[PDB]
Copies of this chain bind each other. A is one copy, B any other.
């Protein structure tokens, strides 16, 4: 009669998603529990309510007790898995427990970013038992604590839904072993994005918009050129926040459109300066009044069009 083991898991943050690296990490907890009568012992010999061991994997205590124990290993791990606060509890009846904080580097496919704020992604963590079916079997999942695992603020990713389930996969020379896979769906956590990149662009565009109120023109033109230089420098300072890809991300569409518009502003300023100096100073005011109300309209139209094209059907 194979013994039955209950298992739970929880994730506190997921860090380091790189297109080139094709791998990531995860930090969380893990809990194992089962009952085997062979572990039982008389309290008279020990003289203690319970017995415990610290700072050792299941493999080591299994080797030292000379009894089989439910070892495991993550399916796709790379290098080594760090473990702190490892402990294992033994009760006189014969129950057991095991708690471990962990951090694993896992292997991942190549993602398809395209839409940058959207970035709906799937993450999966697989846990496998290193003993055949007859020795031990996963029975039921303990949905303890919060798989969301909110601690403070936010991290590089946020959770939106998840689901754990268990299966059986083939083992060596016949037989099988239990598997326990958790699947996650995540979102880019756009708070940092809106608060760091979009607001400075809004201000830098708005200043170039407002310089049109002037009645002189030379100062207007000088300010326009200076602001275009500042816009180029700002576009640079983002730098490594737009990973080197082949195709276009919506951020890139916005950057290109804003840059073209600012260059148009400087061209219009030169033309207005000449028109004013020639003598037809009346029509310059008309052109100013046209542009003042043309710009916000076109920006709204472009935002709406991009929304329709990239966030719904058709």
Contacts and interface: CB of A to CB of B under 8 A. Distances in A.
Interface of A: 13, 15-16, 19-20, 22, 25, 27, 53-56, 60-61, 63-64, 66, 80, 82, 84, 103, 105, 107-110, 112, 114, 152-157, 167, 169-176, 179, 189, 191-192, 195-196, 199-200, 203-204, 206-207, 210-211, 213-216, 218-219, 221-223, 225-230, 232-237, 240-241, 244-248, 252, 256, 259-260, 263-264, 266-267, 270-271, 273-274, 277
30 contacts: A13-B110, A15-B19, A22-B103, A54-B167, A54-B169, A60-B170, A61-B170, A63-B173, A64-B174, A64-B175, A82-B108, A103-B109, A153-B248, A191-B248, A192-B248, A196-B248, A200-B256, A200-B259, A200-B263, A206-B263, A207-B266, A210-B267, A213-B270, A215-B274, A216-B277, A219-B273, A226-B229, A228-B230, A230-B232, A233-B236
Given A27-B109, A203-B264, 17 more contacts: A22-B25, A22-B105, A55-B167, A55-B179, A63-B170, A64-B174, A64-B176, A80-B107, A153-B248, A154-B247, A156-B245, A156-B247, A196-B248, A203-B263, A214-B273, A229-B230, A236-B237
A117 to B, nearest CB: 13
Contacts of A207: 263, 266-267, 270
A82 B75 CA distance: 12
A152 B171 CA distance: 39
Q: How many copies altogether?
A: 5
A223 B223 contact: no
Contact of A233 (B211, B222, B229): B229
Contacts of A170: 53, 56, 60-61, 63-64
A167 B87 CA distance: 14
